[PDB]
Design brief:
globular, binds magnesium ion, alpha+beta, DNA-binding, 4-stranded antiparallel β-sheet, binds 2'-deoxyguanosine-5'-triphosphate, 4-stranded mixed β-sheet, monomer
Length: 522
DNA sequence: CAGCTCTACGGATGCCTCACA
DNA sequence: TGTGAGGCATCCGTAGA
């Protein structure tokens, strides 16, 4: 239980660091915040020796923290950190460099005193063929900490101007809705009462069906009444205002005017990323909102987005010959499923058309039936398509891609309840859910590809001082000094394609890369 | 029985509790 | 003998991939 300070600093302790493998590093501090506190005790545990402790509040100057920094920066020595997302954050925040972080928490979450725990976790992950994903996550710990440290900078002037504008628009829409409803005594945010107000106004479907649910899907069916438009518009404006615009400035840390979110690695069932504080993942797609996120001055962003990542993992899982043949021809499946039922011709597909076709493709790939598909297409598109035509189209798609149909068959027959993705991320379902079963593998593989891409990205940008700032389920965006922007673009391409090659062998993945002044200008 | 899936988050609404003189 | 304030799980609805 040696305590290292100026009184008994002999410099011989550094000789212990020579030729070592494990070190159960765990730090202590005065609180939880990273920009407002400092490290009090750093504890390092070495096998066959008592835990050694360093206190930073009494040792000053340099030449004492030489062995510890050398061990930390070394890539050949593993650092066992309990919940290595807070301690590593503190270590990286200051002028300390840490590498080869191994977390027992991450390993534990991939299932069903640090020295013993490392073995008890490594042996159990090696017996389960989870070593690849565990290595990817442990090497991805550092990119997560880099994202948390950097955060993202906000264009406050545009944000506040837009907040005032949306406030005015919401005010006028509230006035219009209150005038139209002829009530002026009901909170428009109470669904249970506005639905009654709609009922007592003679609003019903053209098929003599009264309003029952106000969900936008059901709310569109009951159009042709000059009251549903007002409800939809207000609700959209009210969400755009309250949900994010009001709550965005309250999440900005002081003295840095940068949003420092919180990134979670295993709080999502499929292995994707959950941001439990201001959800930069949830920003509205429209560019006019994401234009408020900006680089630090004189720097620039690289943004990369996977090109139709899904339906490619599905293609390889299914061994569907026609799918892979089409992919080799560079034709979008989403655009095809658009043009088959929509405005004619392929090149006349816009972003909204591509999005609704994306919804249809994932629906019926994961199990959406032809009557629900009819409802979806009729609601979101002005087809007025009949049921028989929809059934014929459904059958045509399911027979055109024979591999897809055969896969659907086998998954329907089997009830193993155990599922996995291309990196052996095993899951035990509670009950056999058809669409959940079809959906787990593809999204899990997508998340694993994203994590490996991040790992390589951080391990490879070190030569040009590269920093990663955001990652939304398949898209990566990074900061690099403008002097090296083109190199950073090539860096991100190599960071993603190679990662894809580690999982998808048949179809060559592609990535859209862009040079961006904002998070919005994709 | 039969299917589109994962997540977070704001805001109404009965249930629970207690309290005193 | 009366509210009563508060919170506190439970849905509705839309946001994003
Ligand atoms: N199940 C499902 N997933 C959806 C839906 N809309 C979007 N996604 C998700 C699933 C994929 O992980 C994710 C891929 O990111 P994008 O939204 O950009 O789509 P994708 O890459 O397939 O197409 P892209 O080439 O980027 O236009 O989209 C939907 O309606 N259903
Ligand atoms: Mg994409």
């Amino acid at each position: 239980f040696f305590i290292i300070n100026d009184n008994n600093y002999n410099e011989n302790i550094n000789l212990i660091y020579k030729d070592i493998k494990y070190c159960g590093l765990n730090i202590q501090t005065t609180g939880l915040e990273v920009f407002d506190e400092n490290i009090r005790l750093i504890q390092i545990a070495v096998e066959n020796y008592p835990v050694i402790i360093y206190d930073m509040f009494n040792i000053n100057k340099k030449d004492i923290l030489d062995g510890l920094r050398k061990v930390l920066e070394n890539k050949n020595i593993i650092k066992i950190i309990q919940n290595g997302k807070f301690d590593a954050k503190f270590l990286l925040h200051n002028n300390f460099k840490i590498e080869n972080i191994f977390d027992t928490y991450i390993a534990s979450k991939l299932l069903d005193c640090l020295l013993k725990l490392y073995k008890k976790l490594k042996e159990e992950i090696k017996k389960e063929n989870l070593h690849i994903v565990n290595d990817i996550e442990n090497k991805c710990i550092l990119p997560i900490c880099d994202m948390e440290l950097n955060g993202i900078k906000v264009d406050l002037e545009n944000l506040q101007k837009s907040t005032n504008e949306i406030l005015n628009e919401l005010n006028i829409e509230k006035d219009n809705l209150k005038k139209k409803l002829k009530d002026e005594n009901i909170n428009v945010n109470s669904q249970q009462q506005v639905l009654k107000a709609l009922q007592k106004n003679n609003v019903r479907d053209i098929s003599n069906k009264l309003i029952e649910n106000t969900s936008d899907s059901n709310l569109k069916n009951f159009l042709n009444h000059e009251e549903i438009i007002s409800l939809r518009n207000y609700r959209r404006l009210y969400k755009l205002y309250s949900a994010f615009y009001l709550k965005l400035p309250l999440h900005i840390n002081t003295k840095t005017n940068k949003i420092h979110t919180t990134f979670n690695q295993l709080k999502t069932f499929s292995g994707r990323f959950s941001s439990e504080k201001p959800n930069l993942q949830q920003i509205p797609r429209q560019k006019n909102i994401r234009e408020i996120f900006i680089p630090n001055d004189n720097n620039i962003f690289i943004i990369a987005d996977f090109k139709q990542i899904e339906l490619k993992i599905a293609a390889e899982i299914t061994n569907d010959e026609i799918m892979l043949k089409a992919y080799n021809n560079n034709i979008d499946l989403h655009t095809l499923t658009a043009s088959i039922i929509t405005k004619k011709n392929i090149p006349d597909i816009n972003k909204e058309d591509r999005h609704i076709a994306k919804a249809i493709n994932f629906g019926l790939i994961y199990g959406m039936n032809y009557v629900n598909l009819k409802n979806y297409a009729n609601t979101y598109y002005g087809l007025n398509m009949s049921l028989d035509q929809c059934l014929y189209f459904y059958n045509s798609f399911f027979e055109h891609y024979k591999g897809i149909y055969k896969w659907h068959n086998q998954v329907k027959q089997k009830r193993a309840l155990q599922y996995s993705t291309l990196s052996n991320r095993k899951v035990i379902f509670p009950y056999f859910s058809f669409t959940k079963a079809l959906n787990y593998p593809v999204q899990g593989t997508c998340a694993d590809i994203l994590k490996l891409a991040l790992v390589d990205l951080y391990d490879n940008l070190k030569d040009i001082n590269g920093k990663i700032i955001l990652c939304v389920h398949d898209e990566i965006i990074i900061e690099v000094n403008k002097k090296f922007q083109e190199e950073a673009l090539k860096i991100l391409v190599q960071s993603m394609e190679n990662s894809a090659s580690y999982f998808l062998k048949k179809v060559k993945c592609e990535v859209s890369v862009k040079i961006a002044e904002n998070w919005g200008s994709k």
